[PDB]
Design a protein around this ligand. Structure first.
Ligand SMILES: [Mg+2]
Ligand SMILES: [Mg+2]
Ligand SMILES: [Mg+2]
Ligand SMILES: [Mg+2]
Ligand SMILES: [Mg+2]
Ligand SMILES: [Mg+2]
Ligand SMILES: [Mg+2]
Ligand SMILES: [Mg+2]
Ligand SMILES: [Mg+2]
Ligand SMILES: [Mg+2]
Lengths: 215, 233, 101, 199, 125, 154, 53, 45
RNA sequence: CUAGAGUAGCGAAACGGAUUCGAUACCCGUGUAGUUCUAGUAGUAAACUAUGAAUACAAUUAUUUAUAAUAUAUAUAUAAAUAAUAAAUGAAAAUGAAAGUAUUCCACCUGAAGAGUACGUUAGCAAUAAUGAAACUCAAAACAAUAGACGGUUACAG
RNA sequence: UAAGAA
């Protein structure tokens, strides 16, 4: 099946990451499809908001980027493919950050690397009891890649006057779970998993009251 | 009753009034309702799992998934007439909630009918405030009754200290008896010790029953005499 | 009530509406087309701002029932282009509106 | 989840039963769980059931079958009598062991009527109580039958009835007697058979 | 086919009332067995007063010896047996009812089946 | 089979009147193509394969062993207290099959009543069968393909 | 949409299916015969009490 | 008959479970692999 | 109705007695045909659910009814029927799983009256049954419901 | 490009 599924909920558009075995690891195919489809939705006048979720709902939302292929694209010296991969991923992150319609991310499960990039750049990011949030790039010889260095110095609530809690999270790669992520500001809302279905229906129903401007 | 339209669209009709000019002033609720839309679907929604016991609703087992002879020795080689009937109604019927404890609640009170005479309060205090460790039966904030026995039984089962529900239930029963005997001895000895120090009680339970029986029996005597006299005439 | 109107002159599509014994068949019309309808419907259209309309009444031609049923036809048996577009998640384009820019 | 809490809720703790609330046969033991309310909740018709109980009910005890019915009422009786029998038995002091070391539905030992163990003496300001004295009511001319503390018991005489018995006749139940409860066993049906003697 | 006959034989010989019923049973049984039949039971009911003063042919009865006979025979001979019963002065009332054998080859009479003994095998254990 | 398609149209209307979110239709190539055209056109919220008991959670492969117990499960859409799929009717009936050429199809899409068929409405979908492919009428016009005018859905 | 609607039953599946169906029929016939012989035997026990002569 | 059916099914399930020895048997006897495996198992007994 | 049997009761017709202004009626008495059986003819009824058959589908409740379980209890599941309904339909009364949503096939209707008449034909022992006109006349005629009036209409009170 | 009335 396609690695990303696109569906409709009466006004919202649902984007489901659809790679269960690899824990929704993000690719260049996935990033390109998401980027182009979000570009389409940005023009549609019948779209009000986008929901980002995963089919592998409990275990993972997005367990990082699929940087193993990036590492094989560099063992075989195919550096152009790694460049395309990161261009797609980071252009997608830039799109999500600057999107003019609401984007709602369901961080139900593991949320790491590319997952944080998908979820951290939206004002509406929902953690659950299953949210396992982390930024584990220091141990694979890589850097915070998805705009985390821009977001975390700004969104984190506690002990972040000079980005020092952001630095702690980035450098240590500590796994922040559930309501701790909500309390630190890594998530904007905290909703139980059992409710995310009903919420998804509600987000599909609400429309701007009049003059139909969802922006 | 027909699904009503005019209760959930008060905003739209009000806005038509306002745009036309039929209504001059915006109501106080207008912006509030505009910012908080009502739910206006009113659909029937299917369900695919029984909440209580975890049974899956809406799965058909295929003949390929029954490759072994049934209890009568016959293989299943084609669907039966039940499998061929659309079972969409089950998806919408509110499922019956089931708990093994209820089978075990019925047993206890069949074995102890006089435990039904112990009054029970169904008014909840706060279900969220309960923090019980069912490694023991007595709990602070709870009475000792059949539910203590059954919760202890379920605890013993989920920790696999017993494999069979019967043995766990019997163990809980004997702990319950141990606690009940202590309570009754406490009551009796407390009364005895109270009398030995000059506690003067008024009416006891026996005298209470005697006086109520007397109150009833006076009226009964009067009615009997009146009826006999009437019958004689 | 508020009556949906396409271009503030006609009804959006066609309407085949039964109100008790009255069968109304209303059809949207082009600009400049008049109100070619039953006289009761003509008066209602004059009050409602419908300018272009064709239609026919069958079975009962009781004036009161025609009058009452045409209003349910206008309010209940019409869906605007916006409602259809949002319900289906599709874009409904009016070809004549776009031909003239 | 909501289902687990419902399984643990107080309504769920009451075992299902549909035995008639107006039984006119023989009563050997309770059939219905007695439901109690505090004065504060009774003032607001609150009993922990679905629906508010009518204000006519001033008693704080009831028994019930169905929370709600097609008749839009709760099937209940404002009675908690069987608790007063049990307590009265506890006042008598006469004891009645399976309480000591697939499913069997038979009553186990005493069915919760009494947990008192057999051999113990009741100290009193006079001294050790040798025998238990209890008020009662002779019922009918027959071992006679006596209503004692909510239980029907067998009366045996020292030598013969006194003149009051045949003087009163069927009104013998109007006057209170004193009895010695000799013993109290329980039979297979669940019925307690106390043996007493008039004094 | 299994059939259950319930005859009401007359008892004119007061000193030995069973005398008639014995020879009735002998005649009917001889007919059955000589016509490729079988007799499974000859259960005797007792002497009993009839509900009314029943008049077979031109003689009135107030009591009779009741008897039951369970026998396996064909339809033609069963009709023949009924014919002989109906034109016999000794017999006051007669009735032959089928006992269906679609389930069990062995089946007890109506009396034993009512008592609880469904088949003759139970009745002999 | 036009009889089964008519049954499906009536069943969809029935399910929209009571506002059930999910229902089932017979499992056939025509039924699947029709449901897919409705789904792509925005009239259905979801289309799944399944059994007589419910939609399949995971892929279940269809064989003669289970063909009689297969169904197609469709999710119906509602918005603003109105069903998205209100009416669904056949044009080509079993007892009067209507095959049109591309020119008459263009006339029908342009407001002309052809063979007593009312023309296409502003928010309506007319489906056409060509070479055992169901498809939107405007798409058939674009592909210059004559065909059997099958059903309206509004 | 790409998946075939129906997949034909392979000759091996057909052979196993025919095996199972033949067994089902044979088993039902055999059980009928067994109960038949049992009922015959239970009549053969009580046949002592049947008059034939 | 019963023994043949039950043995065929048990052998089929076992081979489909541990998928190395089924490859061993496929190269010993010569998603289609499932049907061919069933063919070989059915001729096997 | 045709033959042949039977005919106790009931009972067209008929004959009488009443009642009545009158009785050609209701009521009473005798009572033939018929009602019964056998072999036929005939093929009509408010032959009615005033509702053709089949198929797919649509929200509930309560009863039974019949199976299948599970240990009287599961207020047990799956079917049919019945009752009250939602929606839908309908001129409404109301229908309600059809008078709803659909599909297929058949029968039938097209103002009242003349008229289910005449004529013809076919069939039948007959009675009749089927098929089934037109001229003439009129602006009528009918259905549901509404409010009254009335009833040799009910019940309750005063 | 389909109007009704007494
Ligand atoms: Mg004659
Ligand atoms: Mg006669
Ligand atoms: Mg007469
Ligand atoms: Mg008259
Ligand atoms: Mg006369
Ligand atoms: Mg004939
Ligand atoms: Mg006639
Ligand atoms: Mg007729
Ligand atoms: Mg009608
Ligand atoms: Mg005629």
């Amino acid at each position: 099946a396609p690695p990303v599924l696109f569906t409709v909920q009466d006004t919202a558009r649902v984007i489901t990451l659809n790679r269960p075995k690899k824990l929704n690891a993000l690719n260049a195919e996935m990033s390109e499809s998401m980027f182009k489809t979000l570009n389409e939705y940005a023009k549609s006048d019948t779209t009000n908001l986008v929901i980002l979720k995963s089919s592998n709902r409990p275990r993972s939302f997005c367990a990082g980027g699929d940087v193993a292929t990036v590492a094989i694209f560099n063992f075989n010296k195919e550096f152009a493919k790694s460049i395309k991969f990161f261009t797609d991923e980071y252009s997608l992150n830039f799109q999500i950050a600057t999107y003019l319609k609401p984007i709602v991310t369901f961080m139900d499960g593991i949320t790491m690397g590319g997952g944080v990039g998908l979820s951290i750049h939206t004002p509406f990011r929902i953690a659950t009891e299953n949210t396992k949030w982390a930024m584990p790039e220091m141990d694979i010889g890589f850097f915070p890649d998805v705009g985390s260095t821009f977001a975390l110095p700004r969104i984190v609530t506690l002990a972040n006057s000079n980005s020092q809690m952001a630095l702690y999270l980035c450098l240590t790669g500590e796994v922040v779970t559930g309501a701790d992520a909500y309390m630190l500001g890594l998530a904007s809302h905290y909703v139980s998993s059992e409710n995310l279905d009903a919420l998804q229906k509600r987000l599909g129903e609400i429309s701007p009251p009049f003059n139909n401007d969802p922006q | 009753m027909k699904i009503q339209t005019n209760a959930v669209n008060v905003l739209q009709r009000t806005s038509a009034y306002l745009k036309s000019g039929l209504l001059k002033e915006t109501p106080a609720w207008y912006n509030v309702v505009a910012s908080i839309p009502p739910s206006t679907k009113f659909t029937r929604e299917p369900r695919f799992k029984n909440p209580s016991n975890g049974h899956i609703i809406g799965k058909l087992v295929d003949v390929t998934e029954q490759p072994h002879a049934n209890n009568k020795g016959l293989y299943k080689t084609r669907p039966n007439s039940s499998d061929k009937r659309v079972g969409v109604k089950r998806l919408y019927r509110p499922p019956k909630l089931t708990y093994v404890e209820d089978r075990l609640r019925s047993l206890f009170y069949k074995q102890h009918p006089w435990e039904l005479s112990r009054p029970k309060i169904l008014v909840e205090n706060e279900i969220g405030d309960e923090n019980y460790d069912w490694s023991h039966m007595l709990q602070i904030g709870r009475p000792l009754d059949g539910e203590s026995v059954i919760q202890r039984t379920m605890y013993l089962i989920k920790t696999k200290q017993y494999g069979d529900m019967v043995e766990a239930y019997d163990h809980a029963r004997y702990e319950f008896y141990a606690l009940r005997m202590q309570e009754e001895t406490e009551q009796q000895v407390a009364l005895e010790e109270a009398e030995m120090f000059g506690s003067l009680f008024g009416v006891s339970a026996i005298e209470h029953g005697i006086q109520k029986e007397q109150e009833v029996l006076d009226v009964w005597e009067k009615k009997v005499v009146e009826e006999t006299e009437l019958m004689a005439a | 009530k508020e009556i949906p109107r396409y271009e503030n002159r006609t009804i959006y599509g066609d309407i085949d509406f039964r109100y008790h014994g009255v069968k109304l068949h209303l059809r949207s019309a082009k600009p400049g087309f008049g109100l070619r309808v039953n006289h009761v419907i003509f008066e209602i259209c004059e009050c409602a701002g419908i300018k272009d309309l064709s239609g026919k009444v069958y079975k009962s031609r009781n004036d009161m029932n025609i009058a009452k049923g045409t209003i349910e036809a206008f309010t209940k048996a019409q869906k605007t282009l916006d409602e259809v577009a949002l319900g289906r998640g599709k874009k409904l384009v009016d070809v004549r509106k776009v031909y003239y820019s | 989840t909501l289902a687990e809490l419902l399984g643990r809720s107080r309504i769920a703790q009451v075992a299902n039963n549909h035995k008639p609330l107006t039984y006119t046969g023989k009563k050997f033991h309770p059939t219905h769980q007695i439901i109690e309310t505090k004065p504060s909740t009774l003032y607001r018709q609150e009993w922990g059931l679905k629906s508010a109980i009518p204000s006519k009910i001033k008693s704080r005890y009831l028994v019930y079958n169905d929370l709600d019915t097609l008749e839009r009422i709760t099937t209940f009786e404002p009675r908690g009598g069987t608790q007063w029998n049990r307590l009265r038995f506890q006042e008598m002091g006469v004891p009645i062991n399976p309480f000591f070391k697939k499913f069997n539905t038979e009553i186990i030992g005493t069915g919760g009527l009494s947990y008192s163990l057999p051999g113990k003496l009741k100290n009193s300001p006079n001294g050790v109580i040798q025998r238990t004295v209890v008020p009662g009511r002779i019922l009918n001319v027959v071992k006679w039958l006596a209503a004692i503390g909510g239980f029907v018991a067998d009366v045996v005489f020292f030598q013969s009835p006194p003149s009051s018995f045949n003087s009163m006749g069927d009104f013998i139940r109007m006057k209170t007697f004193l009895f010695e409860i000799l013993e109290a066993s329980m039979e297979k049906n669940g019925s307690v058979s106390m043996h007493a003697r008039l004094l | 086919m299994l059939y259950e006959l319930i005859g009401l034989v007359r008892i004119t010989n007061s000193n030995a009332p069973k005398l008639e019923a014995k020879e009735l049973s002998s005649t009917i049984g001889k007919l059955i067995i000589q016509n490729r039949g079988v007799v499974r039971d000859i259960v005797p009911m007792g002497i009993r007063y009839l509900p009314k003063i029943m008049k077979k042919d031109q003689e009135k009865h107030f009591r009779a010896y009741h008897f039951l006979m369970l026998f396996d025979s064909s339809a033609a001979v069963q009709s023949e047996i009924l014919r002989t019963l109906k034109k016999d002065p000794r017999v006051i009332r007669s009735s032959i009812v089928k006992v269906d054998l679609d389930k069990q080859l062995d089946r007890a009479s109506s009396l034993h089946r009512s008592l609880g003994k469904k088949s003759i095998l139970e009745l002999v254990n | 089979s036009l009889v089964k398609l008519a049954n499906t149209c009536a069943h969809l209307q029935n399910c929209s009147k009571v506002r059930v979110a999910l229902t089932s239709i017979p499992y056939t190539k025509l039924q699947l193509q029709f449901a897919y055209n409705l789904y792509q056109q925005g009239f259905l919220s979801s289309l799944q394969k399944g059994s007589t008991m419910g939609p399949d959670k995971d892929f279940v492969e269809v064989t003669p062993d289970n063909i009689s117990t297969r169904r197609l499960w469709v999710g119906l859409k509602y918005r603003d207290n109105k069903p998205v799929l209100s009416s669904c009717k056949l044009i080509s009936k079993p007892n009067s099959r209507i095959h049109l050429p591309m020119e008459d199809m263009k006339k029908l899409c342009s407001g002309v009543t052809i063979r007593n068929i009312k023309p296409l409405q502003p928010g309506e979908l007319i489906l056409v069968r060509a070479h055992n492919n169901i498809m939107d009428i405007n798409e058939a016009i674009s592909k210059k393909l004559d065909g059997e005018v099958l059903c309206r859905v509004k | 949409m790409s998946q075939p609607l129906l997949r034909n039953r392979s000759p091996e599946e057909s052979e196993l299916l025919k095996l199972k169906r033949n067994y089902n029929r044979s088993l039902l016939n055999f059980q009928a015969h067994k109960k038949k012989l049992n009922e015959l035997l239970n009549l053969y026990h009580v046949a002592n009490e049947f008059i034939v002569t | 008959q019963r023994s043949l059916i039950d043995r065929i099914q048990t052998r089929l399930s076992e081979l489909l479970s541990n998928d190395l020895k089924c490859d061993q048997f496929l190269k010993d006897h010569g998603n289609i692999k499932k049907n061919l495996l069933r063919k070989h198992v059915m001729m096997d007994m």
